[PDB]
From a paper:
Using a host–guest system in which [name] [name] serves as the host and DNA as the guests, we determined high-resolution crystal structures of three complexes including 5′-[name], 5′-CTTSSPBZPSZBBAAG and 5′-CTTZZPBSBSZPPAAG with 10 consecutive unnatural nucleobase pairs in B-form within self-complementary 16 bp duplex oligonucleotides. We refer to this [name] Isoinformational [name] (ALIEN) genetic system containing two nucleobase pairs (P:Z, pairing 2-amino-imidazo-[1,2-a]-1,3,5-triazin-(8H)-4-one with 6-amino-5-nitro-(1H)-pyridin-2-one, and B:S, 6-amino-4-hydroxy-5-(1H)-purin-2-one with 3-methyl-6-amino-pyrimidin-2-one) as ALIEN DNA. Three hydrogen bonds that join the P:Z and B:S pairs are stereochemically distinct from each other and from those of standard nucleobase pairs. Interactions between the protein and DNA are limited to hydrogen-bonding interactions of Arg 116 with the minor groove of the terminal base pairs within the duplex, leaving the remainder of the duplex free to adopt its preferred sequence-specific structure.
The BPPBB structure includes a tract with five consecutive purines (or five pyrimidines on the complementary strand), offering the first view of a purine-rich tract in ALIEN DNA. Superpositioning of the ALIEN DNA in the host–guest structures results in r.m.s.d. values ranging from 0.6 to 2.6 Å, with the most similar being SSPBZ and SZZPBS and the least similar being BPPBB and ZZPBS. It is not surprising that BPPBB differs from the other structures, since it contains five consecutive purine nucleobases; the other structures exhibit a pattern of two pyrimidine, two purine and a pyrimidine. In the BPPBB structure, the B:S pair at position 4 forms only two hydrogen bonds between O2 of B and N2 of S, N1 of B and N3 of S. The second BPPBB point that falls outside the B cluster is the BS/BS step (positions 8 and 9). For slide versus roll, two points fall in the same quadrants of the graph as B-DNA but extend beyond these values; these points are the SP/ZB point for the SSPBZ structure, in which the slide value is 3.03 Å, and the BS/BS point for the BPPBB structure, with a slide value of 2.81 Å and a roll value of −21.52°. However, the value of the BS/BS step (position 8 and 9) of BPPBB falls out of the range, with an x-displacement of 4.73 Å and inclination value of −26.46°. BS/BS (positions 8 and 9) in the BPPBB structure has a slide value of 2.8 Å, and the SP/ZB step in the SSPBZ structure a value of 3.0 Å. The same dinucleotide step, BS/BS in the BPPBB structure, has a roll angle of −21.5°. The range for roll angles in natural DNA is −10° to 11.7°. This is likely a consequence of the five consecutive purine nucleobases abutting five consecutive pyrimidines across the central dyad of the oligonucleotide. The BPPBB structure has a slide value of 2.8 Å at step position 8, a feature distinguishing it from the other structures.
Author numbering:
A (entry chain A), B (entry chain A): 24 to 101, 109 to 278
DNA sequence: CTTGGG
DNA sequence: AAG
DNA sequence: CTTGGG
DNA sequence: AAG
C-alpha cells in the first residue's frame, strides 16, 4: 500500500519532519529596528489548560526551547496557541513575494497531463530550522502557575504568524525539489507553499512519479498527510478548485 | 443730485419696475410633464401674520393675482414668503445656463478702465412679465382665516425660486442694454443678473455714462437701489470682490 | 487580546 | 479579519 | 416644511 | 443648504 511503501514520507508514520538539506534561516531586521517586548495579556485557566498540551508537545519535539530574550510577543488568550507577531513583522526586513497566486499557478497545467496526485505537507513551516541568532525574535512568555515555571520560550523552526514564512518555505521546497524536476521532465509539479500537485500523462507515469516524489520528500525530511492525500486520480481538489477533464 | 436727476431710475422714487420692451415669458414644460398639486402645510398664525403684509403688497401691485390652477406648491411655514418650487422646477424644460461665473465675468475688466459705478437692480425678477399661459404653473394657496378667503394666488411676473429666473432675467437685460453698449463703445458694462458694473477711463466719462445708464434703465422699466449704488468711485465692491487699483 | 467603508 |  | 460624506 |  501507499502507507507501507513509504513510511518515512507520511506524517502518520515518519515522525516530525526536519528539512536536513536547508541551512537554518537567518531573519534580517530592518535597518532601524530594535527589540520590542510586549507583556503577555493575562489568560484564563481554561485557555491555559487548553494550550498547555500543545506547548508540552512542542517542547518535547525541540520545536520550542526556553530562552531569555529582549523580544516578546503575546499568545492570544482566547484551543491551540496563536502568537501575535505583528510587532515583530513590522521590524523584519521585507522580502519579494515569490509565491504565485493560485490562478497563475494553475495556468501551468496543460491538457496532456490528466492524472493527478495531490499532497499536503504536514507542519511544513516547522520543517525549516531557524538560526540561533534569529530564534530570540519570536519569544513569548509561558507560565505554569501550578508548576512554578514562569519564563520565555521561543521557536527553533520557522513560526506560524511570521510574515515571511510562506515565502521562505516555498523557496526552500523549490530548492529541495529542483533535482526531482530535472530527473522527471515528463512530470508537471505545481507547488503552492505546502500544497503540491503532480500531473502525468498516464496512470502508470503518475504512479511511478508519485513513488519517486514520496521517496524524495521523505528523504529530504518533509512529511505528507496520508489521510488527505489524493493519489493517482483523474479528478482532484487542489487550491479550492476541482480539477476534472482539464477544466478549472 | 443723483437721486433727483433720475427719479424714474431709482426704486426709492420710481415705483415698481416693469420691463416694458420684454414680451411676457412663456415657460415651456418638459415633454412628459403634467401638473402637480402639493397641499399647503398648515402654517402657524405667527408665520401667517408675518407673511400677510407682503402678500397684500404684492396683490396691490398686481404681482400676485387670484387664480384656480391644477398646479400648487407650498409656502414655507417658517418673515417673508418663500415658495418651494422644486416640483415645478423638475417639470420645466431645462435651458442652457448663460450667466457667466463671476471670475470669468471680471476678466473682461481691462486696466485702462479704473472709474467704476456699481448698480443693483431692485426686485429685478418682478420686472419681467409672465405670459398668462405660464402663470398657473406657479400657483400657491392663500387662506385668511379671520377674513374668509381660501383660494389660490399666482405670480404675474418671473418668480423667486424658479430655476430659470436668473438666466431668463440676465438674457432679458442683455437684450434691453444691447443698444446702450452700441452707443457707448468706450464703456465697459458687466452684467451679473441684477448686479451691474460700469467702467470708464475717467471720472468725467464715468459720470456721463452713469447718467446715460440710469436714464436708459429707468426708461426701460428697471429700478436701481439708490441706497446701495456706488457711483463714480475708483474703488468699489462688486460680486464679493473689492475692486481697487485694477486688482481682484 | 490589539489593530488597522457606509 | 488578522496575528 | 420636504428633499436629495465621514 | 436649498426652495
Amino acid at each position: 500500500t501507499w502507507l507501507s511503501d513509504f513510511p518515512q514520507a507520511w506524517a502518520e508514520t515518519g515522525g516530525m519532519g526536519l528539512a536536513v538539506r536547508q541551512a537554518p534561516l537567518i531573519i534580517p531586521l530592518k535597518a532601524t529596528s530594535t527589540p520590542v517586548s510586549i507583556k503577555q495579556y493575562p489568560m484564563s485557566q481554561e485557555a491555559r489548560l487548553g494550550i498547555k498540551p500543545h506547548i508540552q508537545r512542542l517542547l518535547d519535539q525541540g520545536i520550542l526551547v526556553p530562552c531569555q530574550s529582549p523580544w516578546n510577543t503575546p499568545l492570544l488568550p482566547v484551543y491551540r496557541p496563536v502568537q501575535d507577531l505583528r510587532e515583530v513583522n513590522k521590524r523584519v526586513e521585507d522580502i519579494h513575494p515569490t509565491v504565485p497566486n493560485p490562478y497563475n499557478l494553475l495556468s501551468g497545467l496543460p491538457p496532456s497531463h490528466q492524472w493527478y496526485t495531490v499532497l499536503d505537507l504536514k507542519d511544513a513551516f516547522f520543517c525549516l530550522r531557524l538560526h540561533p541568532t534569529s530564534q530570540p525574535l519570536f519569544a513569548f512568555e509561558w507560565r505554569d502557575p501550578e508548576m512554578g515555571i514562569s519564563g520565555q520560550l521561543t521557536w527553533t523552526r520557522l513560526p506560524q504568524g511570521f510574515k515571511n514564512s510562506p515565502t521562505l518555505f516555498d523557496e526552500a521546497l523549490h530548492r529541495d525539489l529542483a533535482d526531482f524536476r530535472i530527473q522527471h521532465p515528463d512530470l508537471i509539479l505545481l507547488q503552492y507553499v505546502d500544497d503540491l500537485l503532480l500531473a502525468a500523462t498516464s496512470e502508470l507515469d503518475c504512479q511511478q512519479g508519485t513513488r519517486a516524489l514520496l521517496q524524495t520528500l521523505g528523504n529530504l525530511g518533509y512529511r505528507a498527510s496520508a489521510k488527505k492525500a489524493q493519489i493517482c486520480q483523474k479528478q482532484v481538489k487542489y487550491l479550492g478548485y476541482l480539477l476534472k477533464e482539464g477544466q478549472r
